[PDB]
C-alpha cells in the first residue's frame, strides 16, 4: 500500500521546518507587477528602484500573518479549527480595521 499520510501528519514536521527557516513565500515578479499596476493609477511611469518593493511585501506579509493568527484564535474560540469568512471579518473588526 502507498505511504499515504493522514491529513495533518506532514503538518508537524512541516511547521518544524518553516518556523525555523526565514525565507520568502510569495513570487516576486507577480508582486512587482501588482505594485506597478497599483502605482500607475496613482502616478504613471514611476521609475522604480531596486528598493521600496521588498519592504512593502514584508510589511503586508507581517500584517496578514498577524491577522491570520488572530483569525485562528477566533476559530478556536468558535469551537472549531478551520478558517472561514466570519472568522476573518470578526478578527478584522476587533482589530479596529
Amino acid at each position: 500500500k502507498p505511504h499515504r499520510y493522514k491529513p495533518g501528519t506532514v503538518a508537524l514536521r512541516e511547521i518544524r521546518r518553516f518556523q525555523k527557516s526565514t525565507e520568502l513565500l510569495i513570487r516576486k515578479l507577480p508582486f512587482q507587477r501588482l505594485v506597478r499596476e497599483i502605482a500607475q493609477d496613482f502616478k504613471t511611469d514611476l521609475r522604480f528602484q531596486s528598493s521600496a518593493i521588498g519592504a512593502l511585501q514584508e510589511s503586508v506579509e507581517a500584517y496578514l500573518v498577524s491577522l491570520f493568527e488572530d483569525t485562528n484564535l477566533a476559530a478556536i474560540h468558535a469551537k472549531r479549527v478551520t478558517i472561514q469568512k466570519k472568522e476573518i471579518k470578526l478578527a478584522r473588526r476587533l482589530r479596529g480595521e
Binding site: L34, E37, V65, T82, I83, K85
Partner: peptide, 26 residues
C-alpha cells in the same frame, strides 16, 4: 500593469494562512 492582483495567488494565500495556524482554508 493589467490584472496583476492575482500576484498573490491562491496557493500563496494558502501558504500565508499556514503561518496563522489553520488546517483548512475555504
Amino acid at each position: 500593469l493589467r490584472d496583476n492582483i492575482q500576484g498573490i495567488t491562491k496557493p500563496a494565500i494558502r501558504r500565508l494562512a499556514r503561518r496563522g495556524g489553520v488546517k483548512r482554508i475555504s
